[PDB]
Symmetry: D2
Subunit: 294 residues, 4 copies
């Protein structure tokens, strides 16, 4: 037998960093969870028990802290870039670095005044980046939002789908639509650290756009197909930023079922009279697509 | 042997109710998870396998749905009271209903600065709960709370002056991160029946609001050297601002962030005045509780 | 306002300890998560920012490690008693320690049916736990328990003859699935202090063993139409077997499996007698409780 | 724009089946969570809102129950294959089904040393999984695996002779605790259709059993200096005992147990050789992965 693939690294490294502005007094905090896996001339640690080729997982840990110490940590795309580039450069036998970064929200609180040093976790929503640094191939970056959960109580439908002897579902012209939204936009390959730094302002700006399109489309679109809603979201993101190659959406649906109460004193709670529903934990629809340029 | 205590019922009954406005076309959503437990003359179901005194747990579920259909689901203090009352009035063997409610956030989305008539975002894992205890001839006990509210402040928190002995290694410190989850409970004065409850309805949302605000505002502003110290200030003001509350309870996990000493690597400065990069700890955590009532 | 109640301490302290038999070669491990909350004359920390009455939570943490180093960690009833006793003995102003311990399974691996000297598998999420209360001048209260035990039986369960009103829709049934997680608590007669506890050491493991075995066996054998009656049987036998227990407490969150009607499809038969494929429901679920003591 | 990829379907379908043998009266339970995703000529639901090409996700759910009703659910490699094959046959516009199946453990209880005919216990959170890709005329790819297997050995594990530089603080060590979750994936050689899959049915359970047991035994016996070295021994053995496996994949998170220096307190003795009490860490953790295949040498 033979190694067809190997990577190893450190997962779940929690990192906090603060930025104290001494002029205005204002503090700013950043919290993230970091995952780094390395590939390279390491066959022999598997085949031959040879550890000399292994940069220890504990040292990878140190490097993360050291790197955050000395470099910006925002936007995550730049940090993940610096961090990965370091590994392919400090070590001759390491030729690929995969860096994963989960950004946790710490929004500054309003006491109508922004407070200079106090934050609240105002949502379990995350902002993430996967950055792959391969020797001679530059830097690929997938950027994403996830954990964004929404509901609209009307202006969705579902009718006209395939009907056979497996179908029981009734068609509907007014229904609840709810979903978690996970959205990944993929950047054009960058050639190295360099080209990445010249693009820094685009990253935050693109996140904000991606979030805002998602929110506003989901809210204003009145469709009978979640598919079509997702596609319109992707289009505008593509339209709005030249450097993005692909947009990818994954929406896990949350069903809310009607509850027939007519067995009880003829209470009317279906159709136009539906007021009380039963949120279902499972099962759940799951819809994806990846959308690119023509 | 003999049965000292017995309770049974339905847990985790997910409920959603929509409100549609007529004129305006604005919709409002409410979603909760409801738990209802019954007490009463039910011993023989344990001792003699007698099911004739069991209201089926499936029926408790239908009851929840139906009560929610014919009644306001908000404030949940009301709704709990209506639902616990129904039990003791419909059944002579049932003498106590215990109703737990967890309300989940569905905030209305802001779209280009306008508020959207029918879309919402789950904008925090934070919850608003009530526990309502309806006991035959003791009226209605209500515990209101907020939990899951997670905060950090990067400075203006200290910790010195604690006892030291041959178990201590903590250094003292005049600047540290302070992050916690906030669990806060306010107990209302006993109420006599649904009647009295109906009549204090607007005090309910108002006091939740007040509670959130005092917690938030006190946590930002207090430059304190004691989590105990800050909590107590929070409780005091809530007692001060609402006559009908008898006790305030705070439970605060105190989630630690460690300084990472980076000096062994090219003498790098990351502690004291210089600390910029820290390791949040998943565990262990400090836990500080108290109940504060009037004198 | 006054402080009605207050405690503080260290939650989620994970602790591992290994025992090496330098004779046999045989190693044995223990891993638990520990929580220690102190009570005492500590008002002033809350009222007047005074920390000189605060034994830092950090030092509570150090103390767990230190005690675990010098004492047996098994049975956890012992160690919790030793641990809470240290606190009220060494601090004048501390009058109560509450110690909680969750023990995680590391069962010895069988490699070619030989027990292995040093490898273990987490063979279940089931926990063994203690709650230990050490109050000054009141001695030691210990609640021992098992939780996270999940079982299922595919037949020999019925449910019929419960109460039927205009809230009821549930069909009565003579063969159904019964599944539940089992949370079971046995409460020891008050001990007077560390000595009394020690002289009872071997009763602890033995009792946990019996509670488990009684639980499984009664659940498997009992062909009942009432979950209540099954729980009660379990509790009698636990009391009959161990004099020193005062009460036994059972919390049964039970999980539903619904029939799936498939007759709309080619008249396929999947209900009552013909039921084979079922849909397990994540929620809601029934929840049944009791405390049984001696009359 | 253009749809470059699209899949839609039903995730988290919980399913239980009971098999009653009325000879003996023994009953056997299966429970699993099922995910089915469809691909094929469905672009237009996205670009033009056309629902006429969508099999409604509620219908995918019905189909899972009905198939479980009319077929065996075990081994999950067969069930998945049946289940996926059905979607490519019933619909022309569907060209691929991806089926994911998590199986949950219900082990028979022993009461007084005898198996009970009809009670079971969730004896572990360990799962047995299949991923089954059923694509038009490329037949049936099947990744099988186990996950949720948590193990610890408290000595006979070492770590020394690793690269040292100005990022390193780790002490070399010759006795330490090794714990991990084991996640392990065997990839089967492509099968040409259902037919081929039924005629390998007995090999499914046996390979899961071997895979598990090889994992257990190697983990316990190896005195390694390398988690890598140890994962590689496991994969080699699996590959040697089943021909129809092409690749083995291992993914091992290592959970750390730190030493606690207690020497500042009454000179207390708790590191290297007298270490008895440790601080298990929730995070961070090492993650070692590898795919192991067959050699091309002779
Ligand atoms: N700590 C540790 N242990 C291993 O077996 N392998 C590794 O790579 C590291 N870093
Ligand atoms: N299914 C079930 N089982 C019980 O033991 N008690 C109950 O009330 C119900 N509804
Ligand atoms: N470490 C710490 N921090 C607090 O705010 N309060 C406390 O009581 C302790 N022990
Ligand atoms: N049942 C359902 N609901 C949707 O919104 N979209 C879909 O595609 C299906 N199949």
């Amino acid at each position: 037998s033979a190694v067809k693939a190997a990577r190893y690294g450190k997962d779940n490294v929690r990192v906090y960093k603060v930025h104290k502005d001494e002029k205005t007094g204002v503090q700013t905090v950043y919290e993230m969870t970091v995952c780094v896996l390395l590939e390279g001339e390491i066959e022999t640690s598997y085949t031959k028990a040879d550890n000399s080729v292994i940069v220890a997982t504990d040292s990878i840990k140190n490097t993360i802290y050291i790197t955050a110490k000395q470099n910006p940590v925002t936007p995550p795309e730049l940090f993940g870039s610096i961090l990965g580039t370091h590994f392919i450069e400090k070590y001759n036998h390491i030729h690929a670095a995969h860096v994963n970064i989960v950004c946790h929200r710490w929004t500054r609180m309003d006491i109508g005044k922004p407070h200079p040093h106090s934050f609240i976790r105002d949502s379990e929503e995350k902002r993430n980046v996967q950055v792959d640094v391969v020797e001679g191939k530059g830097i690929d970056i997938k950027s994403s939002l996830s954990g964004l959960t929404v509901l609209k109580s009307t202006n969705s439908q579902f009718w006209g789908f395939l009907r056979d002897e497996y179908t029981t579902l009734k068609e509907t012209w007014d229904r609840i639509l709810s979903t978690d939204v996970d959205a990944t936009w993929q950047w054009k390959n960058f050639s190295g650290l360099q080209e990445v730094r010249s693009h820094v302002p685009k990253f935050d700006a693109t996140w904000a756009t991606a979030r805002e399109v998602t929110l506003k489309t989901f809210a204003e679109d009145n469709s009978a197909s979640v598919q079509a809603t997702m596609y319109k979201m992707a289009e505008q993101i593509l339209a709005r930023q030249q450097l993005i190659e692909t947009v990818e959406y994954s929406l896990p649906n949350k069903h809310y079922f009607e509850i027939d109460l007519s067995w009880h004193k003829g209470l009317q709670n279906t159709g136009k009279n539906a007021e009380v529903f039963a949120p279902q934990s499972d099962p759940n629809g799951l819809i994806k697509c990846t959308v690119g340029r023509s």
